[PDB]
Amino acid sequence: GAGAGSLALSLTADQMVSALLDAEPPILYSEYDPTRPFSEASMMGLLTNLADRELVHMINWAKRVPGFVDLTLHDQVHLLESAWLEILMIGLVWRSMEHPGKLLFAPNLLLDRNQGKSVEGMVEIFDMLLATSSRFRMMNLQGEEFVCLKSIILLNSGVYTDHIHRVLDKITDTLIHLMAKAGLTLQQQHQRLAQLLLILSHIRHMSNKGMEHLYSMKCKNVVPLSDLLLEMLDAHR
């Protein structure tokens, strides 16, 4: 039985948060400053260059998420294939919380919604990302809560496309503990858990619209895509 006996299932909530924080990827700068204004091709070029670089670090992070390397390489591939854009997106909205009306793609690449017009159908996605960022800001989402949610996205997003269920239960326990220690009543805890988990359905939704966008940009041949990025896209069709 894969996972049976895992360290992941033995962790305390404090040890699971410690493992998750230790696993965090670096915050990447754009290798290029963009000239003003943007074209469709220079915009998609920056964003696909960035996402490519974030993917490499995402793979390192995934390996250091408790429960993950207890799966077959087959299942690890399928979860990363299913989750990668939702994980890019939860990171983007987390980093963008302290920048109202803007998406901090990188410390040196802050875009507002108008700059999203430079790409056909990008403004709708930015609007949805801004709202998610804005909801997290409303909710005062904490660092520790964020890494828990990013782990759930990883483990959950391809889980129906049992050890995975046991690790998710472990992450649910950890979220509730973080909420209890911050002095939320049981009522406020259950309500907060549900509010954050409901946002994940919206991240899934933005991911699915994102992927249609990314496939439409593959066909237009507007910008080169890395082999890794072409594989990720093929996995969704």
Partner: peptide
């Protein structure tokens, strides 16, 4: 498949 090689 790059992801298999990068994940092993």
């Amino acid at each position: 498949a790059i992801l298999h090689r990068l994940l092993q």
